[PDB]
Design a protein around this ligand. Structure first.
Ligand code: CLA
Ligand code: CLA
Ligand code: CLA
Ligand code: CLA
Ligand code: CLA
Ligand code: CLA
Ligand SMILES: CCCCCCCCCCCCCCCCCC(=O)OC[C@H](CO[C@@H]1O[C@H](CO)[C@H](O)[C@H](O)[C@H]1O)OC(=O)CCCCCCCCCCCCCCCCC
Ligand SMILES: CCCCCCCCCCCCCCCC(=O)OC[C@H](COP(=O)(O)OC[C@@H](O)CO)OC(=O)CCCCCCCCCCCCCCC
Ligand SMILES: CC1=C(/C=C/C(C)=C/C=C/C(C)=C/C=C/C=C(C)/C=C/C=C(C)/C=C/C2=C(C)CCCC2(C)C)C(C)(C)CCC1
Ligand SMILES: CC1=C(C/C=C(\C)CCC[C@H](C)CCC[C@H](C)CCCC(C)C)C(=O)c2ccccc2C1=O
Ligand SMILES: CC1=C(C/C=C(\C)CCC[C@H](C)CCC[C@H](C)CCCC(C)C)C(=O)c2ccccc2C1=O
Ligand code: SF4
Ligand code: SF4
Lengths: 733, 40, 150, 165, 80, 144, 64
């Protein structure tokens, strides 16, 4: 039999091409490998994590190297407002001379790509000023990548493999990760800001060669050890400070100004220094909570066992959950993806409205790409969070050990949960779509005053509570007599209120009826996607149509045409259907973010306010209007620098449409077609001398759903990425 | 005639009459009270 | 295949045959851009679909505004059909089980047991909506265009 | 006014919008005769347009910078400033009709469950019974509440089928 | 090879055996039902996984179950 | 009843031939032979496509996979009320007999058969997947 | 003398049955000591179109 795959004898004995495809697709499902034990499972995962870490630091090293080698960082730092950053050089032998000239720009030697990832603003903010600064960082991270790779090898060796119990010491790992991984890293990052980043923003060079002889503050550590910590907040950078120079600069290293630096339109460095110092203290303290070898602290099992409501409303409460969580990796992975997935959305939300990197706001293409980038990644992570929660129920859930606790009771009323999610999705869809169609008919008939425009009073009321005085609610921070206004009036409100009432920045943009409709469409996306994913998990173990679904696994094709038909009945298929709704939801979010910002960046916000209340406005004034430059990247008269995005735009449409083939036409058609191809090859003279070793067959039922979904997603992403960058960059960049 | 009235009681026939009635009522109301947006 | 046939006819006629006769000569609706532009996929996207769809998307507020509405509605029906084509009745029968439970809880469950469509009916419902949406989209786009300029 | 809005009766953009719509209608009018069929139809449209803009201003709606009416949904703000007719009152108008339709259908469904062949009473409607239940539904909120308090609104958990768990 | 299991709810109707298009199943004597016979799966190496047997079983839930497993020339239904 | 012995010289039906017949698999892995007795010459439908005339008396056909042989067997039994039997033939010359395994068609109960893959429980009494985890391979709860 | 009376109504308790927690009419009860003697008929068919099934003595209880 064939060697590959070495981890499954069932695959290795398959004489068809399914062996190749399935061998690739089951490589990282360690639990399903032949001869796998629990202890070997954890040691492989530990080794794999070292590999991922080494790739991350190597990928970062490659970015640093190419910007220094081929970028214009040293030129960009001089005039960041009027210089486009360079990502890397182009050496494409297929280029013609017009293409070579078209992509030559920014004073570069030859063709180059413009960066959109914002690394220039990030690196410039944290104190990098020269190409040699980037070169040393690149070599340092390449070395760090090597060390992690060695550690991955080291801990696979006979005397360094941790035992199974080592991976299940929950109290000790939480203490270290909270205090050391989070707390000390944040404390160390405060050291960089106080010692390097802040001085570099004030025109003083601090490097490894002189940082031991430079005083971060004129009073060196006397305020710190004497408790007079307020001395570090005196004489902050003035409003006239020019970033990177000593004119208008101050001396404070810890402040709470609370606003935006007037020139860079980004958060103050002294606030970001005090921010990281504050959480570092909290995280170091929080890391002394759990039991270890020293006789103090909590044991997490005791905490869970205690929290049972005395009235029996939650049944057994949280009894038995410690083993349920501590023994299942899919439960832990589901909690990790759900938490990280939400934080990825939070990063996108807060970075566009509280830009932390100098000159990030004015780079419109970078801001658009960064928000879209992280929202699409958050969407994928959330779908994975529910997928592994569904896998937990099939593989790791033990009904006997979870008898009567909160987890078991979720399955008890799963129909109630699914029924109510179904109602909310239907309600939002009916009325959200209905109002849009009503407004479209009114616009078509020429009566824009007959449409249903509902003021977002609840959201506009929140903005009033934060100090936005436009709506006249005179509430909390919007009223100058409230205690909330008075108490903070000496710490951060003067800066915060100044920024929130500036209508040229993205801090709490003004909202109207156009924002009301879009937000309710977003809710429909979240609820429907949750409905599909939640049903896939709660029904994973069985249903009326298939009472014993657990016996078949997480992913199987179907149960056949009997009992009416069971296509797409597994929990794997519920995730597969939910990915479509995730893309649809994130699409609505990113269209909404992009259109509301393009109108702001052009100064004509009225277009969004007027055209966003009906769906023809989106198609006409957003998709059609902003495609004009994209599709002219190359035309019968020539081409320009946008021809790559024009080409990638159609490239996306093609991959997307190809995915329809794997989703619409199913296996039986193709297997019978391949059988005539097998006949044709064998009877053809001069070709039947050559022969195959793996019998050709059609893709499997499950494989084609993944292959179709992969093409659908890739085409989805590449089409909008090309349009997002091209429309934003051509308009302003 | 009993069978014919039974045929008129079938679901498709009832729905056609019911929605024809329901639609007619709404159309007639908007004919005499054009452009209703607020109860007032 | 027929969509390309009627796009070929529409662009070729406007570019090379249809037009207004004047003293100097014949000026065509699209000015003879078929020969140089229809040899790339980008040419069809820009010169045919994007440029000529200007009439349909600007129809609101005029007598042709109906074609604008059907242009959007056709786009909707087409995308709606992909729900039936990309899914299978196994998911939907389980979904109806939870929905039926809510009706049973309220003593309002029907006597005719709800069932998800059969496998074949899902494919038939999918293709019928796919065709109606796609064909109606071209229908609105053609008439609003040719009536406006032709 | 509320949320920075202003009454449509006092809105400059709102007034300008009416002129634009009337101007469009007038432009088409002057290509016909005085009392021809097309001219009469256009004049009728202009009368409805003028009436519509007077009614919305008279109703005391709020117009934004766009000069289009906006609706107030918070019950407190609506009753505070006399906007109850936009969303608040129509909210309880719809629920009465929606509960009427749902309650009537539920009564009919229970009625035929006692018959020998309930399925044949669903494809072939029992019109005499349906009309009887249609009229009695006007008091559904009273009947609906009394069922809830007597405990006959919901089925018992033990009489409802559920999947293995 | 797929896995085919017969459970003790079989009533010996023989419909699964008739339905099978590869002669995988057969009936054997039994004392656990009125028919005094039970379905058997002695030749699962020829099973292709069509699940025609499950379509034909009257009992609820099924008394014959097919669990698709390792693929081969016979189970993949290849003539080449 | 005793296991029949295949006769390779048995005459075959009158068939022109088609492109739906045996492939290179028959020469390297295995093929299947079905034989039966015909009361009179008659036209039947080949599972590979087309129509063939069965000679009166013994007939023999060769097919590429087992399902094709048992598809023809169903046609012969249901319509023509015949009693065909087919074998598995290997390239080395070995011949394996099957269907009927014991001479009686499986639909009819016969003494001497031993139950196989019979679980003396219901589907609802299987253990949970967690209890058959790390058993060396992917194992369903039904297997144990 | 074993099982419920013919024609009486019973409630099904087999969790894997389509008619779990539902009422059906007893058609006959086998007295030969078979595994599942009780035969029950239902007015609503299951997903396969069947309306009858066999149950053990302890899987069925009298209506209420
Ligand atoms: C102080 C001791 C210490 C430290 C520093 C670490 C560190 C680490 N451990 Mg842990 N570990 C410890 C003790 C420690 N461990 C002990 C005592 C045990 C035994 C009980 C373990 C057992 C253990 C296991 C079993 C595993 C780890 C793993 C890891 C790694 C997790 C992945 C990672 O890099 O996350 C980095 C995370 C952060 C820096 C924080 C992320 C969250 C913040 C809030 C995100 C946002 C921050 C900021 C805004 C981002 C800026 C971005 C920039 C672009 C601007 C990490 C290197 C895993 C690994 O990968 O091993 C190779 C792993 O599998 N550890
Ligand atoms: C981890 C980050 C870090 C590190 C490594 C340093 C390192 C240094 N700082 Mg800086 N500093 C930091 C954070 C850091 N700082 C922060 C967050 C602030 C803002 C409050 C400052 C503000 C600051 C000022 C104002 C000054 C320094 C100075 C110095 C230098 C002399 C320190 C000395 O002799 O202390 C001697 C101190 C001791 C012997 C006792 C230290 C006891 C404390 C509580 C530390 C306990 C251990 C700690 C928990 C370990 C953390 C992890 C570890 C790996 C670092 C030295 C290069 C001085 C200098 O001259 O710089 C050139 C100076 O004037 N720092
Ligand atoms: C850190 C998070 C994490 C980790 C450790 C895992 C780990 C695992 N997952 Mg999970 N998963 C994650 C995130 C994670 N997942 C996310 C984010 C999602 C949502 C998308 C999922 C959704 C998911 C599903 C639905 C399933 C798993 C499964 C698995 C297991 C097998 C994986 C395998 O064999 O892949 C093999 C890898 C492949 C076949 C290829 C992966 C790449 C895909 C197809 C995209 C490729 C795009 C391509 C590069 C684009 C080219 C563009 C072109 C222009 C060049 C394994 C335990 C499977 C399992 O067995 O669970 C029990 C399973 O069914 N995961
Ligand atoms: C534009 C495409 C589209 C549309 C409109 C829908 C709509 C819907 N999907 Mg679907 N879906 C789609 C694409 C779409 N999907 C795709 C591509 C996939 C991937 C396979 C899925 C996968 C999917 C899943 C897995 C699920 C849904 C669900 C839903 C429902 C969400 C709740 C809702 O909006 O209720 C409001 C209803 C609508 C907006 C539907 C349209 C209503 C129209 C406008 C009514 C018109 C009536 C009028 C009288 C005219 C009739 C004319 C006719 C008689 C000739 C809804 C029925 C969920 C569901 O069923 O929840 C209950 C669900 O579980 N969808
Ligand atoms: C969410 C869905 C939705 C909602 C809430 C509305 C709401 C409204 N629409 Mg709109 N519409 C919708 C969808 C919707 N539409 C769709 C999908 C379309 C496309 C077909 C249209 C097309 C449309 C048109 C063309 C018109 C409206 C109009 C109206 C108004 C009708 C008032 C009326 O008839 O009072 C009548 C009064 C009643 C009391 C009716 C109920 C009668 C019962 C017997 C009362 C019983 C009480 C106890 C109202 C503001 C009209 C308008 O002027 O809007 C400003 C109008 O001309 N709609
Ligand atoms: C859907 C949720 C929701 C939300 C976000 C709001 C939001 C608001 N409501 Mg409304 N309200 C709602 C539902 C809601 N309401 C409902 C269901 C009712 C009952 C039908 C009311 C009845 C109501 C009244 C009677 C009043 C408000 C008022 C307000 C405003 C300030 C007080 C408040 O409610 O704070 C946040 C909201 C909540 C925490 C939810 C419960 C709110 C209760 C029901 C009302 C609280 C009134 C408050 C004590 C008034 C004090 C005086 C005020 C000037 C400070 C604010 C814009 C007040 C107003 O007009 O201010 C200008 C006011 O007088 N609401
Ligand atoms: C013009 C032709 C109009 C339709 C004539 C239908 C005649 C017919 O089939 O009658 C059939 C029945 C009456 O005729 C019935 O025929 C039966 C034949 O087996 C029996 O003989 C019945 O006894 C007899 O009453 O029509 C009606 O009862 C009235 C039908 C509705 C008429 C009004 C609406 C259409 C105008
Ligand atoms: C007019 C005055 C009306 C006062 C009504 C008081 C009701 C108290 C709650 C009983 C509720 C009750 O019966 O609790 C019972 C149950 C708690 O279960 P346990 O088993 O822990 O406790 C049972 C107790 O009854 C006795 O220990 O909680 C719930 O079901 C909901 C809890 C809501 C918790 C709300 C938290 C606070 C949110 C903010 C609310 C506004 C602030 C003021 C109200 C707290
Ligand atoms: C199925 C399953 C699963 C999964 C799950 C998931 C995936 C979930 C998710 C979830 C989520 C995703 C959630 C979230 C949540 C959130 C929240 C809950 C929030 C909250 C918040 C708050 C509370 C806030 C507050 C505030 C404000 C608002 C303002 C100011 C400040 C403060 C803070 C005060 C698992 C794994 C378990 C397993 C089993 C099964
Ligand atoms: C087109 C199609 C086929 C036929 C397609 C086949 C046989 C695949 C042919 C692929 C060729 C060999 C090209 C592959 C090119 C890829 C880019 C290879 C990537 C390889 C990775 C390992 C990197 C199916 O078999 C099928 C099965 C079930 C549902 C839908 C379908 C379906 O849509
Ligand atoms: C959405 C969907 C369903 C669910 C759709 C269903 C059950 C059809 C719904 C039809 C109508 C809306 C329900 C019946 C309405 C009655 C006639 C009563 C109407 C009364 C008045 C309101 C007119 C499938 O069953 C299905 C099956 C196979 C592949 C894909 C799918 C699929 O995508
Ligand atoms: S498994 Fe089903 S079809 Fe086969 S004999 Fe038993 S009851 Fe009959
Ligand atoms: S799955 Fe098909 S081949 Fe296998 S036993 Fe059932 S009917 Fe026979």
């Amino acid at each position: 039999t064939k060697l590959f795959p070495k981890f499954s004898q069932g695959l290795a004995q398959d004489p068809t091409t399914r062996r190749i495809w399935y061998g690739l697709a089951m490589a990282h499902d360690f639990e399903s490998h032949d001869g796998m034990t629990e202890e070997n499972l954890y040691q492989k995962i530990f080794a794999s994590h070292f590999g991922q870490l080494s790739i991350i630091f190597l990928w970062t090293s490659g970015n640093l190297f190419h910007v220094a080698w081929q970028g214009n960082f040293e030129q960009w730092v001089t005039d960041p407002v009027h210089i486009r950053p360079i990502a890397h050089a182009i050496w494409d032998p297929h280029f013609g001379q017009p293409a070579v000239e078209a992509f030559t720009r920014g004073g570069a030697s030859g063709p180059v790509n413009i960066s959109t990832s914002g690394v220039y603003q990030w690196w410039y903010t944290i104190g990098m000023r020269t190409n040699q600064d980037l070169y040393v960082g690149s070599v340092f991270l390449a070395l760090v990548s090597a060390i992690f790779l060695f550690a991955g090898w080291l801990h696979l060796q006979p005397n360094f493999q941790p035992s199974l119990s080592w991976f299940k010491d929950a109290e000790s790992r939480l203490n270290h990760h909270l205090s050391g991984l989070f707390g000390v890293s944040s404390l160390a990052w405060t050291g960089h800001l106080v010692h390097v980043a802040i001085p570099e923003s004030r025109g003083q060079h601090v490097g490894w060669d002189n940082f031991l002889s430079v005083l971060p503050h004129p009073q060196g550590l006397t305020p710190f050890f004497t408790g007079n910590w307020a001395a570090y907040a005196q004489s902050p950078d003035t409003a006239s400070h020019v970033f990177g120079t000593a004119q208008g600069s101050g001396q404070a290293i810890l402040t709470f100004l609370g606003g935006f630096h007037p020139q860079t339109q980004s958060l103050w460095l002294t606030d970001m220094a005090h921010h990281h110092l504050a959480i570092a203290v909290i995280f170091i303290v929080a890391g002394h909570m759990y039991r270890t070898n020293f006789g103090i602290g909590h044991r997490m099992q005791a905490i869970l066992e205690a929290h049972t409501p005395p009235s029996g409303s939650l049944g057994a409460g949280h009894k038995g959950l410690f083993d349920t969580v501590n023994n299942s990796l899919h439960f832990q992975l589901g909690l990790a993806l759900a938490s990280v997935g939400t934080i990825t959305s939070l990063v996108a939300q807060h970075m566009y409205s509280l830009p932390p990197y100098a000159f990030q706001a004015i780079d419109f293409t970078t801001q658009a790409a960064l928000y879209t980038h992280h929202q699409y990644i958050a969407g994928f992570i959330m779908c994975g969070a529910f997928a592994h929660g569904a896998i937990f129920f099939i593989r790791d859930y033990d009904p006997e050990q979870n008898k009567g606790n909160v987890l078991a009771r979720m399955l008890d009323h799963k129909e109630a949960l699914i029924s109510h999610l179904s109602w909310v999705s239907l309600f939002l869809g009916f009325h959200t779509l209905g109002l849009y169609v009503h407004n479209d008919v009114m616009q078509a008939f020429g009566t824009p005053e007959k449409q249903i425009l509902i003021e977002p009073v609840f959201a506009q009321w929140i903005q009033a509570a934060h100090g936005k005085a436009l709506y006249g609610f005179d509430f909390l921070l919007s009223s100058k007599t409230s205690a909330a206004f008075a108490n903070g009036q000496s710490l951060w409100l003067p800066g915060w209120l100044d920024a929130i009432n500036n209508n040229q920045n993205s801090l709490f943009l003004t909202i109207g009826p156009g924002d009301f409709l879009v937000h309710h469409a977003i809710a429909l996306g979240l609820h429907t996607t949750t409905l599909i994913l939640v049903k896939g998990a709660l029904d994973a173990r069985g249903s009326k149509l298939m009472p014993d679904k657990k016996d078949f696994g997480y992913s199987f094709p179907c149960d056949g045409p009997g009992r009416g038909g069971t296509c797409d009945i597994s929990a794997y298929d519920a995730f597969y259907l939910a990915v479509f709704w995730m893309l649809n939801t994130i699409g609505w979010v990113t269209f909404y973010w992009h259109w509301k910002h393009l109108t702001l960046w052009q100064g004509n916000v009225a277009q969004f306010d007027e055209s966003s209340t009906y769906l023809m406005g989106w198609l006409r004034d957003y998709l059609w209007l902003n495609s004009s430059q994209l599709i002219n990247g190359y035309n019968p008269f020539g081409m320009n620098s946008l021809s790559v995005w024009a080409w990638t735009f159609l490239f996306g449409h093609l991959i997307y449409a190809t995915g329809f083939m794997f989703l619409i036409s199913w296996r039986g058609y193709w297997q019978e077609l391949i059988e005539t191809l097998v006949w044709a090859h064998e009877k053809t003279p001069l070709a039947n001398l050559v022969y195959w070793k793996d019998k050709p067959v059609a893709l499997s039922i499950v494989q084609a759903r993944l292959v179709g979904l992969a093409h659908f997603s890739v085409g989805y992403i590449f089409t909008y990425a090309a349009f997002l960058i091209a429309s934003t960059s051509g308009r302003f960049g | 005639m009993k069978d014919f009235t039974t045929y008129l009681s079938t679901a498709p026939v009832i729905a056609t009459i019911w929605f024809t009635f329901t639609a007619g009522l709404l159309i007639e109301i908007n004919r005499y009270f054009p452009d209703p947006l607020v109860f007032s | 295949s027929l969509s390309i046939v009627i796009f070929h006819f529409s662009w070729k006629m406007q570019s090379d045959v249809w037009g207004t006769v004047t003293a100097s000569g014949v000026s065509h609706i699209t000015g003879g851009n078929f020969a140089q532009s229809a040899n790339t996929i980008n040419g069809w996207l820009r010169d045919f679909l994007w440029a000529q769809s200007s009439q349909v998307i600007q129809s609101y507020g005029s007598a042709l505004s109906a074609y604008g509405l059907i242009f959007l509605g056709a786009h909707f029906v087409w995308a709606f059909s992909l729900m039936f084509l990309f899914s299978g009745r196994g998911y939907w029968q389980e979904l109806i089980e939870s929905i039926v439970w809510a009706h049973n809880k309220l003593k309002v469950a029907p006597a005719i047991q709800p069932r998800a469509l059969s496998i074949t009916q899902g494919r038939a419902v999918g293709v019928a909506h796919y065709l109606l949406g796609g064909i109606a989209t071209t229908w609105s786009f053609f008439l609003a265009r040719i009536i406006s300029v032709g | 006014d509320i949320a920075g809005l202003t009454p449509c009766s006092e809105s400059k953009a709102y007034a300008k919008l009416e002129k634009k719509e009337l101007k469009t209608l007038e432009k088409r009018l002057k290509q016909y005769e005085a009392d021809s069929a097309p001219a009469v139809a256009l004049k009728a449209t202009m009368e409805r347009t003028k009436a519509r803009f007077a009614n919305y201003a008279k109703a005391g709606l709020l117009c934004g910078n766009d000069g289009l009416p906006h609706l107030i949904a918070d019950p407190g703000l609506a009753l505070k400033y006399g906007h109850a007719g936009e969303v608040f009152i129509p909210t309880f108008g719809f629920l009465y009709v929606a509960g009427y339709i749902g309650y009537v259908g539920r009564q009919y469904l229970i009625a035929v469950k006692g018959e020998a062949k309930p399925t044949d009473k669903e494809i072939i409607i029992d019109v005499p019974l349906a009309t009887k239940l249609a009229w009695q539904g006007a008091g559904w909120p009273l009947a609906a509440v009394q069922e809830l308090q007597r405990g006959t609104l919901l089925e018992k958990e033990e009489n409802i089928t559920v999947s293995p768990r | 090879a797929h896995i085919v299991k017969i459970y003790d709810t079989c009533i010996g109707c023989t419909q699964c055996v008739r339905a099978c298009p590869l002669d995988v199943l057969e009936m054997v004597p039994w004392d656990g039902c009125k028919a005094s016979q039970m379905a058997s799966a002695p030749r699962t190496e020829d099973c292709v996984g069509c699940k025609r047997c499950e379509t034909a079983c009257p009992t609820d839930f099924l008394s014959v179950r097919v669990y698709l497993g390792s693929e081969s020339t016979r189970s993949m239904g290849l003539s080449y | 009843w005793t296991v029949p012995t295949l006769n390779p010289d048995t005459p075959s039906p009158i068939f022109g031939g088609s492109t739906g017949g045996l492939l290179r698999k028959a020469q390297t892995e295995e093929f299947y032979v079905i034989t039966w007795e015909a009361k009179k010459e008659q036209i039947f439908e080949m599972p590979t496509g087309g129509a063939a005339i069965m000679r009166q008396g013994p007939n023999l056909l060769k097919f590429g996979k087992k399902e094709q042989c048992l598809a023809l067997t169903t046609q012969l039994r249901n319509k023509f009320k015949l009693t065909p039997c087919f074998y598995r033939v290997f390239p080395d010359g070995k011949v394996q007999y099957l269907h009927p395994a014991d001479g009686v068609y499986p639909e009819k109960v016969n003494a001497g058969r031993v139950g196989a893959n019979q679980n003396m429980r219901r589907i609802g009494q299987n253990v949970n997947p967690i209890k058959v985890k790390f058993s060396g391979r992917m194992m369903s709860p039904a297997e144990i | 003398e074993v099982g419920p009376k013919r024609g009486s109504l019973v409630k099904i308790l087999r969790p894997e049955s389509y008619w779990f927690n539902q009422v059906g009419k007893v058609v006959s009860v086998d007295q030969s000591g078979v595994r599942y003697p009780v035969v029950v008929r239902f007015e609503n068919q299951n997903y396969a179109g069947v309306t009858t099934n066999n149950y053990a003595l302890d899987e069925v209880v009298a209506a209420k």
